[PDB]
Amino acid sequence: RNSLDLYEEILTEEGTAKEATYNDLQVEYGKAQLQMKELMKKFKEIQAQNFSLINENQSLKKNISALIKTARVEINRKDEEISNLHLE
Amino acid sequence: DLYEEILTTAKEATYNDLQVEYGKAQLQMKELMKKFKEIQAQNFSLINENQSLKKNISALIKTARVEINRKDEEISNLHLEH
């Protein structure tokens, strides 16, 4: 019966192994999901950061364009009056 | 009949199922890291650019204020010698 005795010991030895490989997979899966959750929370942060950065960036581009134009016009009104005084 | 039980099975199919799930999770994670580093890079670019614009605006106001006042002095002096 030692061929059957070995057969039964074999079935359980392979069963113990496959269940422990499965167990390992279940654990590594959950670990990975924890990892994901953390990175997702970090990602949402820099994305919101990214959102306000672009907003600030657009407004600054607006402002520095507007201030240039209002300045160049304000200096032209000067140069025009100077010419008129040079013309009187 | 020996090994027919262990060969024939849902124990190993559900292992495969989860193994596929675990693989997908990893790839989803690798894709997320990619997007993260991409968005992060933009922020470093935006932070850099924004701070230099604020400085540029400041420098702009200063030289504008100076040149305008200078023209204004020219105008005063013109009336005076007139």
Author numbering:
A (entry chain B): 52 to 139
B (entry chain A): 56 to 63, 67 to 140
Verbatim from the authors:
FLASH, Flice-associated huge protein, was originally discovered as a protein involved in Fas-mediated apoptosis and later in regulation of expression of several genes, including oncogenes. Subsequent studies showed that FLASH localizes to Histone Locus Bodies in the nucleus, suggesting a role in expression of histone genes, and that it is essential for histone pre-mRNA processing. Biochemical studies revealed that the interacting N-terminal regions of Lsm11 and FLASH form a docking platform that recruits the HCC to the U7 snRNP. Our crystallographic studies of FLASH NTD demonstrate that residues 71–137 adopt a continuous and stable α-helical fold and mediate the formation of a coiled-coil dimer between two FLASH molecules.
To rule out the possibility that the observed FLASH NTD dimer is a crystallographic artifact caused by oxidized cysteine residues, we determined the structures of the FLASH NTD C54S/C83A double mutant in two different crystal forms at 2.1 and 2.6 Å resolution, respectively. In addition to Cys83, we also mutated the other Cys residue in the FLASH NTD, Cys54, in case it formed a disulfide as well even though the residue was disordered in the structure. The two structures adopt the same coiled-coil dimer as the wild-type FLASH NTD, confirming that FLASH NTD dimer formation does not require the Cys83 disulfide. The individual protomers of these two mutant dimers also show differences, similar to those observed for the wild-type dimer. Interestingly, residues 53–70 from one of the protomers in the structure at 2.6 Å resolution are stabilized by crystal packing, showing strong electron density corresponding to an α-helix. This protomer appears to form a single long α-helix from residues 53 to 137. The other protomer showed weak electron density for residues 56–62, while residues 51–55 and 63–66 are not observed. It appears that the helix for residues 53–70 does not dimerize, and it may also be structurally independent of residues 71–137, even though a single long helix (residues 53–137) is observed in one crystal form. The LDLY motif (residues 55–58) essential for binding the HCC is situated in the N-terminal helix. Whether the flexibility of this helix is a feature needed for binding the HCC will need to await further investigation.
